[PDB]
Amino acid sequence: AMIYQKQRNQLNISISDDQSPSHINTGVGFLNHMLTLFTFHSGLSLNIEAQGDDHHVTEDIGIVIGQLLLEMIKDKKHFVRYGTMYIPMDETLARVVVDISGRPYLSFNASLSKEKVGTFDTELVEEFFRAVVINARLTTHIDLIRGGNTHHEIEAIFKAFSRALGIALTAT
Amino acid sequence: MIYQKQRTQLNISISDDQSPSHINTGVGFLNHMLTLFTFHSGLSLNIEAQGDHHVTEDIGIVIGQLLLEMIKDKKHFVRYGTMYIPMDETLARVVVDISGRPYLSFNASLSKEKVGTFDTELVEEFFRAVVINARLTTHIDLIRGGNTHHEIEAIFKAFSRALGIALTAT
Amino acid sequence: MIYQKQRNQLNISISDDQSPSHINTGVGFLNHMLTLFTFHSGLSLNIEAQGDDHHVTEDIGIVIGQLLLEMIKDKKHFVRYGTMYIPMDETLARVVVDISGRPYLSFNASLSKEKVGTFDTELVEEFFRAVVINARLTTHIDLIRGGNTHHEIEAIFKAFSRALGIALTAT
Amino acid sequence: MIYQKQRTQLNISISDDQSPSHINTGVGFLNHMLTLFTFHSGLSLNIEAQGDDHHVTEDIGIVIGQLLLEMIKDKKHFVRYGTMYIPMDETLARVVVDISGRPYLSFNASLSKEKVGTFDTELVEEFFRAVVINARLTTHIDLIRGGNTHHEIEAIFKAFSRALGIALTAT
Amino acid sequence: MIYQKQRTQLNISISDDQSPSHINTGVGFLNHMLTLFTFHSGLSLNIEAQGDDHHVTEDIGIVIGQLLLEMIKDKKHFVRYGTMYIPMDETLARVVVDISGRPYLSFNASLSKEKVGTFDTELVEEFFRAVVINARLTTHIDLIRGGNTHHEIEAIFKAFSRALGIALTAT
Amino acid sequence: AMIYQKQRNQLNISISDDQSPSHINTGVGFLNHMLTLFTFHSGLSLNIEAQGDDHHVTEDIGIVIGQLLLEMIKDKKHFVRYGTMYIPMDETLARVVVDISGRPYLSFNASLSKEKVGTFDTELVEEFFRAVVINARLTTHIDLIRGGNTHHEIEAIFKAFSRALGIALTAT
Ligand SMILES: [Mg+2]
Ligand SMILES: [Mg+2]
Ligand SMILES: [Mg+2]
Ligand SMILES: [Mg+2]
Ligand SMILES: [Mg+2]
Ligand SMILES: [Mg+2]
Ligand SMILES: [Mg+2]
Ligand SMILES: [Mg+2]
Ligand SMILES: [Mg+2]
Ligand SMILES: [Mg+2]
Ligand SMILES: [Mg+2]
Ligand SMILES: [Mg+2]
Ligand SMILES: [Mg+2]
Ligand SMILES: [Mg+2]
Ligand SMILES: [Mg+2]
């Protein structure tokens, strides 16, 4: 296995395409749950240690994950490249399309139903995906086909992106 | 008869006696609402959670499953219940049919995104979890609203009373 | 007490006991709806028709209406007012009946399809007017929400049947 | 492994193997759609009904759903998620299936005609809710474009069946 | 197997192996698009055109279609259904193909500009119509979002090619 | 005379450009009447024996007729090629334009007034014409200029198509 690792200053993050346990400590509860979902659905192991508001943390974590993904992508030579996933979450349906293209581009098309989920600013979801996709040099389209519950909306998007990414990273 | 199960840690029992209810979900607003449910349904609830959306949904799923155990044991019951509840400006109607056809029609646009720290979008999630897992057909209608706490309380009181009516032995 | 008559071939009896019902209208869908009526109203119905769906549905409703009226006239103290809401998956119906002696139907239900099987759905309002007017009831039928026509009609039959049985209850 | 039950008289079995399918629902159109289901899901279905279309259609859906749940409960690792697009000339349908344990159907398809032959087109949604809710699946059915009602329903049945088949694939 | 024919002079062959492709249509933009087709479908194309863009584009599409039909007729068991989403910066396209034997194209893409370079953009639909009808496929082409015309028609070519390659996969 | 014949399995169909009696047994009453009209107005003799819902039957009959027409067209070398017919049916007026072009294409522009005529699903009319036109490799435009009665609408369309086809098949 390859492990890609980065310290940015206060974050310490590693990612790996093996099946080791993930340890996610962002200091943001909702972000913890979402990145735990990312690890399971992408097949990638994340270890995050953050020290220190939610905006800087979420964005800086997204930037580092994107940068480490690019390192991972650079070292792979032959992969599926294209991944599409539909995920339903009760009333919600999301579609995410990723192309490991080297052309950094995000089309984010999801009007989330509430301004917060618990204490988490829902506007941070697009900021996270922008940071990851652009720094990983992916072309990604995120579409909320229908929604209703904001937790479901965000979760479907995280599940679909992770799975689509996983599919695209599959060795050829 | 006591129906119970476990499902973080969640321990819940429900019973149609008048034993005291102990409700500790870890969510203040949900405690108050489920306290209302016990009173208006006549069902005793005991809930122990140690560990908001996952908690709320988990509790609703377990309540619904336990309700189905209870219903399966009952032979002869009223089956149909309707209740209107006013809360100042608010008026809600809930209609329940213990039909064995799991179906929720939830028609209530709540006035605010939160009450205290509680996400109001959780109300629909709780009711869907209960109704579907209890195999009820339930229509919840907010005829008029205004104050979000009143809207939610009216819906809880109406559902609970309508359920209590439908569960009544014949 | 049994109330009965013929309308000529049509022969129908109604009773407020728990005796069995035999319903042979020659219209399958109507058979199923009248079976719902007997169960939810608490009344026993026996119908023998012999010998188009319009005439048969309407004739049955008129005779049922007239027989209900006989039964009402014999009763002294009854509840008089009945309301029932019935949900049927997507559908919610409300029916309000008043045994007032003032024959009046307010029928507010746009049914989703022109037929269920071979049965013309326009016959549902025709059945209810025949019953309500001839029994001298005041009734309001409201489809609060709908979607499936079989569900819409069944909800209405159930709600009306139960609201009538409530209203007919001895006092 | 074979999954089996009876409920009118209804007798149904399902199996994730290649045994032959005998489908006799009493409803010609539903016979055809269930034949598509077997071929496209890879699940063998045997159905014998003896004993309106509404009750038959819904009762079959409920049992198929209950038997799918038996099958799912035995399976350990499976793909879980399935999506299928099926074109039928002018029609395009998409069906997304999640074997989630959370019973939920989003049915988004405005069918072009009230009937295909003698079959009430509103029965299609009733069938899918019966299966999906009782199998504890989350499914979204979407008619992306349509035109001809037989094509619309056929595309939906093919897409759902294929998506279920994908989701059930052992890991 | 190599499928070839000639139809100004046009000579084309197509093969389901990894032989290099030589594409000389006399239309620069079409050369690039067909090179994308070769790579994404896995099919080797060889084209010699000797001798307006309309006639060449349409004739090439017809011959490719007819040769694909020859290939399909030779194959026994194949996947049959393929769907591909392809993003191209701002653009997202979806193509659904079904090797059905029912020739049908649903082309749903309003392209942003009348020309890319000297190439008439209205020729893209004409190309796909020629291919899809003559290969006897049912395909739906959908531009979900666009912006840049080069990106729009590259996304469409990529998605069709992949969807076809998937559908052509032996089972 | 040439006779073109096909068995597809349960249909047995022959078509001929002579003037022999037609025997049409599709198992669909309304389709029987329409194909009887086709035979008279096109000048082509049809013999159909079908064994066995209406959708599959109508479509399969349309497909075979289209395929046999193509065989017939292939063997003719010199014909008028272009045919246009207007047919009035009381309130209804239809126009059908056919080009024996070899480019399979149907433009069907007729909103029929009712969902059924007797027991026949009126949506089958377009399915029939699509099957015939595409498999015969005709370019055909069908236009209901005005309508009112669905039986008249379908009949005018069948009459006009048959006549236009007949005209186009005329030897040159
Ligand atoms: Mg960019
Ligand atoms: Mg949830
Ligand atoms: Mg979650
Ligand atoms: Mg309160
Ligand atoms: Mg009348
Ligand atoms: Mg039903
Ligand atoms: Mg019924
Ligand atoms: Mg049809
Ligand atoms: Mg067809
Ligand atoms: Mg079919
Ligand atoms: Mg052209
Ligand atoms: Mg480019
Ligand atoms: Mg390019
Ligand atoms: Mg065409
Ligand atoms: Mg005529």
Curated annotation (Swiss-Prot), chains D, E:
Binding positions (Mn(2+) 1): H32, H55, H150, E154
Cofactor(s) of this protein: Mn(2+)
Keyword Amino-acid biosynthesis: yes
Entry's Gene Ontology cellular component terms: cytoplasm
Annotated residues for binding of Mn(2+) 2: H54, E58, E126, H151
Name listed for the protein in its UniProt record: Imidazoleglycerol-phosphate dehydratase
Family in the record: Belongs to the imidazoleglycerol-phosphate dehydratase family.
NCBIfam families, per the entry: PRK00951.1-2, PRK00951.2-1, PRK00951.2-4
UniProt cross-references to Pfam families, sorted A to Z: IGPD
Gene Ontology biological process: L-histidine biosynthetic process
Alphabetized GO MF terms: imidazoleglycerol-phosphate dehydratase activity; metal ion binding
Chief localization: cytoplasm
Native species: Staphylococcus aureus (strain N315)
Localization per Swiss-Prot or TrEMBL: Cytoplasm
Cofactor, free-text remark: Binds 2 manganese ions per subunit.
Residues holding substrate: 32-40, 54-58, 80, 102, 150-158
InterPro entries: IGPD_sf, ImidazoleglycerolP_deHydtase, ImidazoleglycerP_deHydtase_CS, Ribosomal_Su5_D2-typ_SF
UniProt entry tagged with the keyword Lyase: yes
PANTHER family membership: IMIDAZOLEGLYCEROL-PHOSPHATE DEHYDRATASE, IMIDAZOLEGLYCEROL-PHOSPHATE DEHYDRATASE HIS7
EC number: 4.2.1.19
UniProt keywords, alphabetically: Amino-acid biosynthesis, Cytoplasm, Histidine biosynthesis, Lyase, Manganese, Metal-binding
Record pathway: Amino-acid biosynthesis; L-histidine biosynthesis; L-histidine from 5-phospho-alpha-D-ribose 1-diphosphate: step 6/9
Catalytic activity annotation: D-erythro-1-(imidazol-4-yl)glycerol 3-phosphate = 3-(imidazol-4-yl)-2-oxopropyl phosphate + H2O
Xref: SUPFAM superfamilies: Ribosomal protein S5 domain 2-like (SSF54211)
